[PDB]
Amino acid sequence: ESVKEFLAKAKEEFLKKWESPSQNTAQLDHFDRIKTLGTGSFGRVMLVKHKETGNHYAMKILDKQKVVKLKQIEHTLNEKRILQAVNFPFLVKLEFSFKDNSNLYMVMEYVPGGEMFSHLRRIGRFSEPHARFYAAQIVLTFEYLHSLDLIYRDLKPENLLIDQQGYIQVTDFGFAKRVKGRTWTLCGTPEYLAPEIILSKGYNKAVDWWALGVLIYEMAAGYPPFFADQPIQIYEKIVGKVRFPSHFSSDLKDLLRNLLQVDLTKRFGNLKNGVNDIKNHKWFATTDWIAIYQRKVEAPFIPKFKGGDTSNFDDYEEEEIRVSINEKCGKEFTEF
């Protein structure tokens, strides 16, 4: 009952920030560039150092022209607007944002541990306690996001960072949508799509609980439950024959049968008791939910701290950051 009050205040605060977003809280020459951490079809992520403070940040730089070319205006504006409005322990925080003639900039605290994806592929698979520790953080994060009527729709190890305490930071919010009924976009990453996203019928927040099932499976097995060479073939397998590795525990298989439940009216997380069917499942019996939320549980894995180290990121050709003399796509990004 005290949970209802906490989340009611959280929704009020979210909606106030959504309605009056922060804008223009730094500028590019406040930062020194150190290294490219990632590239994508319309932007880059840079390790930068704030000149005045010496603090390290991940700066996500989006090329406005490429965003427009690739039809990502609404998603990019949405990511920034969501990020500055949400507040939860396992969500990255937006420290600054601004724009110039060429680019949009979002500046987050640097997390040198990098992505869950790279740790998972290095180790192979996580033990069940290890996977459970991460899963519990996702469960709580979705309880929070769903209370705001947001569907997350972008869960995968690629969008999950491991911080210096060994806890999760969820990175990406372009796809997060307010949905109290149904929505219909074919949106997400193939291996993680619920059957009702692939099919033309509408879907709701239950797709996030399906995706949690996929994540737990991939964390525990080392590979996702439905895989193939091309997306169309992944979709066909999804639409529910799952096989479990023999090392999966009885409790883990039972949980996954109820999360990877094709019938969304039978899927855990989407029943009358909502998230509590998940929290009370036997696989989570050893999980101290409050202690996880408070980050008082000893993490199973702490990324080695090497001192601005980028050992957990790949190397990229370092290319210019060019700011045109002409303003590009001003009207489209006015609200950023």
């Binding site: 592929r121 690629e158 990453t189 193939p190 291996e191 996702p224 895989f227 193939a228 060479d229 096989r243």
Partner: peptide
Amino acid sequence: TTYADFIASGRTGRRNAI
């Protein structure tokens, strides 16, 4: 093995949205 089939036929690297 299933893992071998994942390496042979699955997508083992970082996965794009769409």
